[PDB]
Design an enzyme around this catalytic site. Structure first.
Site, PDB file in Angstrom:
ATOM      1  N   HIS A 118       0.887  -1.156  -0.068  1.00 39.86           N
ATOM      2  CA  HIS A 118      -0.099   0.063   0.071  1.00 39.86           C
ATOM      3  C   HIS A 118       0.778   1.299   0.083  1.00 39.86           C
ATOM      4  CE1 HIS A 118      -3.425  -2.527   2.183  1.00 39.86           C
ATOM      5  NE2 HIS A 118      -2.884  -3.245   0.967  1.00 39.86           N
ATOM      6  N   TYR A 122       0.995   4.582  -2.693  1.00 37.52           N
ATOM      7  CA  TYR A 122       0.981   5.969  -2.392  1.00 37.52           C
ATOM      8  C   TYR A 122       2.091   6.718  -3.320  1.00 37.52           C
ATOM      9  CZ  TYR A 122      -2.284   4.474   1.088  1.00 37.52           C
ATOM     10  OH  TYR A 122      -3.123   3.791   1.776  1.00 37.52           O
ATOM     11  N   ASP A 237      -8.013  -5.245   0.837  1.00 34.04           N
ATOM     12  CA  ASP A 237      -6.968  -5.677   1.959  1.00 34.04           C
ATOM     13  C   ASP A 237      -7.303  -5.459   3.398  1.00 34.04           C
ATOM     14  OD1 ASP A 237      -5.529  -6.526  -0.486  1.00 34.04           O
ATOM     15  OD2 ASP A 237      -4.121  -5.172  -0.247  1.00 34.04           O
TER      16      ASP A 237
END
Lengths: 340, 340
Positions: A118, A122, A237
């Site tokens: 994740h 970003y 997730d």
């Protein structure tokens, strides 16, 4: 006493989740709790690579945004980046030294790993929409206001790591370290881990979902579709991560695992309630920085405070705590289209 | 002094790899050492799941094998299971609190994660070839000829973790702890890291390769093909992990990253040399246990010892050490079919 390979042949089905013997053999043919094995398999099925999602239209959509919607987008991205930077490393440094059954040791490592993914998404978004990424990244550390709605998250994890180090080295008792009396107490470290786990649950089940709702606001306007594809995959997730902490917490509560943890759960109930109230109020204060330069048509502080209330009551319910806010219907049912 | 989000804004391009300020923001747009971002990317595109490799035929292959071969096979599989049980957890609990650049923090977590997948493929093989998994799995913990080695590997990580807690809690100096004087020296903690990394380099670069040679000998005789397709995939991952530790080690002794690691790598030169000869001799000895009831076709103790000498020289050479054994051509050139 931590060891990376404990030499006592033990029954790994009879250990507690935490504080029993360190795992030595990693086996998956059996498990005390199947849910953590189910979660590892599901997370592995969801494997995705950020780099293969097209975010090119987003540089155009972003530069076409008025300065104040541009501020809402980026402050919300910044706070997501902060949280999964902490979530990438912390499950592994704080919980992994305390785990005693293998399905949960591998689950914690799989969960920490999905957060490094994740964090990579970003960087993928920022580097495509902004021209020098470093002004976004450097601002995450230094922004008084982002540290403010995040107050308490690293603190807690860091209190746990310090106490664990003390226990691993000295064992239980009242000790003398550089002429200071230091008491190490396993009951206390158990209270500390239990509350750490309630806070991890609030951060993934509430705080990330409020951010998600600010992300999909734009996707309702048909803007930022690349960002939206990524956040939908992050939301997927995140549902597993939240199911994980809810099961750990409710199994500790049932008294089927460590009997001392069921007594702590009951004994700590007011502290559990208060931290969700604390996390709710921090999320509602943030809106003052987020709508500082004016708000958007579908997203203003009244909407945000109402979804914070909505989502906290649901989350507190799932782990059996009293609801703090007056019961209400979902303020933004469009989030349903995009989620989990 | 360990924290999960250092509040100091700091230029991450100027941090040493280890013992600088903890990483706060996880960013991947820039990196001090490009090689760890290149390893995260290769490891993510190498992603595989052991469930979709059919191992079902290996049950008959194994029942049909002569007992001495069943013994060589299962003993070898047990040692592989022991080594990635230690490798899922240990990069994470031992290196992660010492790393201070983001790309190395995420590589360590990605590395740990690809090892839990290796652990899970071993349960996948065992389950399908013997069907009382417990007689293989409990014998990993007690087995004398296996236990021999585990003790050495767990030692390095366990003393580094114990020393790191002392440093994080008390800092450098002479401290008193319940009547004892405890000296915490960062020079000495750096020595422990260097030799721990050197030992992991031997673990993945030598001990695992000696074990791949026994697995692929069955594959050469068209036996245990499920197992061989899995070990192929594991071997492909091993190649990245070894590249990881070779780069960290050579960046340290070059003085480029911390002048003082260059000093320590020079004082620790003979201790490193012996470290490797000891790993090689432990592998040579293990072959005697394997081939006690008679050898098999394509492999025998002489061949295998020769292979150990050869792989050890290639690996010591790559980290700038002197070669201990007579220079040799690869004794089993056929293994290159299964390797990278």
């Amino acid at each position: 006493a931590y060891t990376t390979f404990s030499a006592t042949k033990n029954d790994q089905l009879k250990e507690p989740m935490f504080f029993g013997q360190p795992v030595q053999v990693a086996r998956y043919d059996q498990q005390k709790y199947d849910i953590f094995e189910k979660l590892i398999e599901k997370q592995l099925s969801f494997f995705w690579r950020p780099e293969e999602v097209d975010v090119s239209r987003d540089r155009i959509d972003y530069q076409a945004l008025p300065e104040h919607e541009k501020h809402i987008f980026i402050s919300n991205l910044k706070y997501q980046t902060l949280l999964d930077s902490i979530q990438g490393r912390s499950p592994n440094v704080a919980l992994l030294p305390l785990i005693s059954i293998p399905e949960l040791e591998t689950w914690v490592e799989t969960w920490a790993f999905s957060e490094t993914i994740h964090s990579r998404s970003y960087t993928h978004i920022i580097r495509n929409i902004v021209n020098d990424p470093s002004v976004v990244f450097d601002d995450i550390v230094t922004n008084e206001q982002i540290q403010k709605r995040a107050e308490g998250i690293s603190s807690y994890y860091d209190e746990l790591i310090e106490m664990t180090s003390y226990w691993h080295l000295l064992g239980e008792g009242t000790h003398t370290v550089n002429g200071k009396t230091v008491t190490v107490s396993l009951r206390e470290l158990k209270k500390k881990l239990y509350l750490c786990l309630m806070s991890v649950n609030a951060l993934e089940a509430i705080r990330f979902y409020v951010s998600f709702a600010c992300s999909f606001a734009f996707a309702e306007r048909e803007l930022m579709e690349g960002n939206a594809k990524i956040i939908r995959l992050i939301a997927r997730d995140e549902a597993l991560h939240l199911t994980g902490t809810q099961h750990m917490l409710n199994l500790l509560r049932s008294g089927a695992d460590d009997p001392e943890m069921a007594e702590i759960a009951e004994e700590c109930k007011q502290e559990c309630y208060d931290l969700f109230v604390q996390a709710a109020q921090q999320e509602k204060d943030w809106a003052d920085y987020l709508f500082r330069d004016g708000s958007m048509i579908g997203l203003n502080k009244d909407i945000l405070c109402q979804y914070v209330e909505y989502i906290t009551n649901i989350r507190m319910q799932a782990v059996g705590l009293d609801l703090p806010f007056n019961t209400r219907s979902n303020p933004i049912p469009w989030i349903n289209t995009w989620l989990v």
